[PDB]
Amino acid sequence: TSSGSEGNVKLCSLEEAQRIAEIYPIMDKSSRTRLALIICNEEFDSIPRRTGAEVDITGMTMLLQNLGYSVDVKKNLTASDMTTELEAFAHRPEHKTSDSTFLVFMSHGIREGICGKKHSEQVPDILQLNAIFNMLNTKNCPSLKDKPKVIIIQACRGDSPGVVWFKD
Amino acid sequence: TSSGSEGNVKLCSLEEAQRIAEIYPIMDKSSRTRLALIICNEEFDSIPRRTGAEVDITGMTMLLQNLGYSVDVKKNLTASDMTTELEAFAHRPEHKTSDSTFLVFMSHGIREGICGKKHSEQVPDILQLNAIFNMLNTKNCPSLKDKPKVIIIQACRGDSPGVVWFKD
Amino acid sequence: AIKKAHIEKDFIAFCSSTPDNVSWRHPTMGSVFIGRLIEHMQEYACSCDVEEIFRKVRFSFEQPDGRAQMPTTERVTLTRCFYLFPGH
Amino acid sequence: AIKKAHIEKDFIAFCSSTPDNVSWRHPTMGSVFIGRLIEHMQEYACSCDVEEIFRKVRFSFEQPDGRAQMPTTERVTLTRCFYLFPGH
């Protein structure tokens, strides 16, 4: 049933879990404090409005909660604000009593990275994927040492259609 | 036995293969023309000699042959020569009657990419990983469309030791 | 006593398209990649590790239409399989 | 008739270390990553797909010594499992 905390996520039965040395350890459900962060930019100064972004926010928020994560949702941030938010997320004490984390980024994007709210061609406002890794690594986030860190990014990575033609 | 063409690679039995819709198709052994390319830089103009590189060449060459690939070995190339060699490899007619390919790169390396033979800090001679993908993609190598392209790179990606300290 | 640990480990990134290339978003239905990811997570989290789920998402994009994209898994240092074990 | 195909698909890259970081090579024994990859390929090509083998190589590097490195899988657009099926 979809009435439970896991919603529309298909459950893993006890028999299936026993069927599954090479797996990341899962902390006790009763005491663990899983955290997830969604950063979504919808309204921009110079780039068109990202219509439908709210559907993405709703969908990802509910899914991550279904999977057991407490979800923080931050909207319409500059690359500087995104950096500050990531730094704060890395400092959260809940990670110590967590076994994993999810980070979701949704915005306009270019080849170099993810667009902040103030982005324009004249004055770039970009957050690089490299910066995300650095802020969440063992040096800057020791609490997530040995724990899976999943980064999801919705954004263009350039202007090309990503296709080529071929004949049969 | 290690006397066969597969050498020290453990064989997949017929029963194991049948045990294994979501797998890349394998072409007939009798007619397929699998190709692999190893580029290894050992002797440089300004960077120290890569002692032991010959052990790597021997090991990778023999392994790729064991797996069914005809291996081309090219040594001590500039980034320009590497580009020319990659372009030639992408043009090989054997890829048409192949199901996959392996590309191996072994050299000194920096954050930006793989060092050519003429590399120095004053005059960089670097091949980017991005260029390797571009030269082997569907646009520039249509013969390898839908076929696994495996790229292996031995090189530093910077000067850092890659470690941090923690206490128990 | 102090011990050494890898500075970067246990990461997986999943991008909506390949480098240089666009990602699509429906004005009312949302981003295609996001919608596709949710559906696959709901279906396969019980039985598949995250890497395998991401591969399945990729496979669902295989046949290109007028709005094509190929999600890319990036910078992977997962040393183990990450199973979500939904319900536990 | 012409049809559309993804410009970039069915790629997997495997690097000897993480970005910013060194990779090690023994003067007589060769590169650690290369040697470790060969051993894992010889053992696991029969039973595991290339992605899984690369993960196993990563796991073997987990405990850092005086010369640490963490091999990284990059830019993956494999839509299927790639099994080598050695012997066939």
From Swiss-Prot, chains A, B:
The active site is at 108, 156. Changing residue 165 to A: Mediates autoprocessing but is unable to interact with Gasdermin-D (GSDMD) and mediate its cleavage. It comes from the Eukaryota. There is a cross-link at residue 10 (Glycyl lysine isopeptide (Lys-Gly) (interchain with G-Cter in ubiquitin)). Heterotetramer that consists of two anti-parallel arranged heterodimers, each one formed by a 20 kDa (Caspase-1 subunit p20) and a 10 kDa (Caspase-1 subunit p10) subunit. Can form a heterodimer with isoform epsilon which then has an inhibitory effect. This is Caspase-1 subunit p20. The lineage of its organism: Eukaryota, Metazoa, Chordata, Craniata, Vertebrata.
Curated annotation (Swiss-Prot), chains C, D:
The chain holds residues 317 to 404 of 404 of the full protein. This is Caspase-1 subunit p10. Changing residue 2 to N: Mediates autoprocessing but is unable to interact with Gasdermin-D (GSDMD) and mediate its cleavage. Heterotetramer that consists of two anti-parallel arranged heterodimers, each one formed by a 20 kDa (Caspase-1 subunit p20) and a 10 kDa (Caspase-1 subunit p10) subunit. It comes from the Eukaryota.
